[PDB]
Design a protein around this ligand. Structure first.
Ligand SMILES: *[C@@H]1O[C@H](CO)[C@@H](O)[C@H](O)[C@H]1NC(C)=O
Ligand SMILES: *[C@@H]1O[C@H](CO)[C@@H](O)[C@H](O)[C@H]1NC(C)=O
Length: 670
């Protein structure tokens, strides 16, 4: 069937998110904020630009006068999140130093847009995709909600923090919105880049890709400019280095900060340029394969080769895997290694002067949220990842995943606009851990954007490009017509509903829990055999006996349908299906014309469904047309040559005399 489509205006899209319950689709974009419905039908929208502003205006002209001017410029939506507790939506733009609006859920009514404080502004960058974060509501009923936000600052370190823990009041008009959850004379739930570090390398910055809540913490995948591999001259050879970061939800002074490099390799190829990430529960399959508990989560990642460029990395990309276990371990290992006095905190950009690790007798837990020394703590060894798939022709751009009845499925967007469906398994008799079993095309010629989430019923995945969104069905099982290639494609959702003769999902096959109703393994397609397989046109209604294999309890009833000429009703005994061959009256127009023999499909039509599902080849033949003694005998099937009548027939009473019976080729006359 065709692809559900939603085009865009004259500009471009940036962010999407789905209400976990209503399945509605909120879409962030330049100047606009579209809200769609379950089938990508355009609903409500909300306009936010262009506005009169200059990037050089701190504060924006809408609060205090500015020299250097202004001019109408586009307001790119950089971040977009849902506040389920307060039933609203936060869409942060790039205009007027990046204020944020609060659109009420059910009509996008501008509930507020606080735009007059210093900490009401977030960043003056014009690029999108560099901001990310999550919300954390406190105890319900008690109107506070925390919100952890990271963004680049383009060297404007006095104005905007690069990472904070601001507050969310229930009343949007309030001026305490977006205020830091802990404020004192020196440390705040903040993290400004030192004016020193920008003095070494001018436009150093932290770009923030993904962010997810896990246990009682929040993690970020950042990408910073390398303080080592880059000379102070900021020409165009500047290299970058990807690093994870982690905080506590309950850490007001921001002592728990921690930062480890990430990457992976396969066949000696380096991958250290992060692109996208998705936090998923791995499903019972990959869980027991990896040793993880049923509540422990996993993070899929996408790294580009090398450390250069970044604004347009090279195509070669890899889909690597990091376990939440191995990360809580490398953390409790670097902060256990510190609270022992070994090494030193190693954040060359945040600390400048190499403070050393301090000894301490405190014994670290899994839930240790830092103390006033040995923080913020750096990363010494680059965390290495497990490669699942590499592609060199058509680059990878986005990722997502989920589980199906144990199995672990990975969806990956491409720069060409396709979305490959990946199955990950380590015990595959190939060694290799991932197979690209499909390549749906959502829109040729447009890179997929990194936002790529499923509907609540996990049935569809909304795939957004710059130009349009495309509701692609996960279970695209219908395209396959026969058991032989429905299960041979290796789609984990697809099995063959044997009695309905269709390739579909498991719960869509009626009564599929009873034995022999759904088809799992390739060596289990329906098989039918006939005794006898061949009969001469001279015979009529001879009783056949058929043995069907891998079929359910057919006591519901089954018919013998000879293509579309007869519909004999059958009887069932033990494991065999008895029914009658056609009468030669039915057979007559069938062989009228063909010549030597004709094969016909013996189907099994079930009474429960009414549709034919099992096939087997059945053959008729007519010994008459054969002209010589060798034409008769050497034919495969049992034909008798009547040497005295000079004809070829079946039933030997047809010969001139018995002694005219010629069965074998050697009894031919010369
Ligand atoms: C989408 O669903 C709504 C639900 O009422 C329906 O009115 C609308 O016609 C549908 N549009 C498309 C294109 O499927
Ligand atoms: C015809 O059918 C009989 C019984 O099913 C089988 O033994 C024989 O080998 C078959 N021969 C041909 C030529 O199909």
């Amino acid at each position: 069937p065709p692809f559900r489509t939603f085009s865009a205006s004259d500009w471009g899209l940036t962010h999407l998110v789905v209400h976990e319950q209503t399945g509605e689709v909120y879409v962030g974009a330049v100047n606009r904020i579209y809200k769609l419905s379950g089938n990508l039908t355009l609903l409500r929208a909300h306009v936010t630009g262009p506005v009169e502003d200059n990037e050089k205006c701190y504060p924006p002209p809408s609060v205090q006068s500015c020299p250097h001017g202004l001019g109408s410029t586009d307001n790119v939506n950089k971040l977009l999140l849902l506040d389920y507790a307060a039933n609203r939506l936060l869409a942060c733009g790039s205009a007027s130093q990046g204020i944020c609006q609060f659109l009420r859920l059910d009509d996008l009514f501008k509930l507020g847009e606080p735009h007059h404080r210093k900490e009401h502004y977030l960043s003056s960058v014009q690029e999108a995709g560099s901001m990310a974060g999550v919300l954390i509501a406190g105890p319900p009923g008690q109107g506070q909600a925390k919100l952890f936000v990271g963004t680049p600052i383009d060297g404007k370190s006095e104005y905007f923090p690069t990472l904070s823990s601001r507050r969310l009041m229930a009343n949007e008009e309030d001026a305490d919105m977006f205020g830091f959850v802990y404020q004192d004379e020196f440390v705040s739930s903040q993290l400004k880049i030192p004016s020193d570090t920008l003095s070494k390398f001018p436009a150093f910055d932290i770009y923030y890709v993904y962010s997810f809540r896990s246990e009682q913490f929040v993690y970020y995948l950042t990408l910073q400019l390398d303080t080592q591999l880059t000379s102070p001259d900021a020409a165009g050879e500047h290299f970058f280095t990807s690093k994870i970061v982690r905080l506590c939800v309950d850490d007001p002074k921001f002592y728990s900060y921690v930062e480890f490099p990430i990457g992976c390799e396969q066949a000696g190829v380096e991958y250290r340029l992060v692109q996208d990430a998705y936090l998923s529960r791995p499903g019972r399959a990959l869980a027991h394969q990896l040793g993880l508990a049923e509540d422990e989560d996993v993070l899929f990642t996408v790294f580009a080769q090398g450390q250069k460029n970044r604004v347009k990395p090279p195509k070669e990309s890899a889909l690597c895997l990091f376990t939440l276990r191995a990360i809580k371990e490398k953390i409790k290992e670097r902060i256990q290694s510190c609270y022992r006095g070994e090494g030193k905190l190693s954040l060359p950009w945040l600390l400048n002067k190499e403070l050393g690790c301090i000894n301490s007798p405190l014994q670290i837990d899994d839930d240790f949220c830092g103390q006033d020394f040995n923080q913020p703590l750096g990363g010494t060894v680059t965390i290495e990842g497990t490669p699942l798939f590499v592609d060199k022709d058509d680059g990878l751009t986005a990722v997502a995943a989920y589980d199906y009845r144990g199995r672990t499925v990975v969806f990956a967007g491409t720069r060409s606009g396709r979305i490959r469906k990946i199955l990950v398994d380590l015990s595959n008799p190939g060694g290799r851990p991932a197979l690209a079993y499909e390549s749906v095309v959502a829109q040729e010629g447009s890179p997929i954007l990194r936002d790529l989430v499923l509907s609540p019923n996990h049935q569809y995945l909304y795939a957004m490009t710059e130009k349009q969104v495309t509701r692609v069905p996960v279970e695209s099982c219908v395209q396959y017509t026969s058991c032989e290639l429905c299960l041979g494609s290796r789609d984990p959702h697809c099995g063959w509903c044997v009695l309905h003769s269709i390739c579909s999902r498991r719960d869509a096959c009626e009564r599929a829990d009873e034995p022999q109703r759904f088809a799992a393994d390739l060596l289990q397609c329906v098989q039918l055999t006939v005794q006898p397989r061949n009969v001469s046109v001279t015979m009529s209604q001879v009783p056949l006996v058929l043995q069907a294999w891998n079929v359910p309890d057919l006591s519901a009833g089954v018919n013998c349908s000879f293509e579309d000429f007869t519909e004999s009703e059958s009887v069932l005994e033990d494991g065999r299906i008895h029914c009658r061959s056609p009468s030669a009256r039915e057979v007559a127009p069938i062989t009228r014309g063909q010549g030597d023999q004709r094969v016909v499909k013996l189907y099994l039509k079930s009474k429960e469904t009414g549709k034919k599902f099992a096939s087997v080849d059945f053959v008729f033949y007519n010994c008459s047309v054969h002209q010589s003694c060798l034409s008769c005998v050497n034919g495969s099937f049992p034909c008798h040559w009547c040497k005295y009548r000079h004809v070829c027939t079946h039933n030997v009473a047809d010969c001139a005399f018995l002694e005219g019976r010629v069965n074998v080729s050697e009894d031919c006359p010369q």
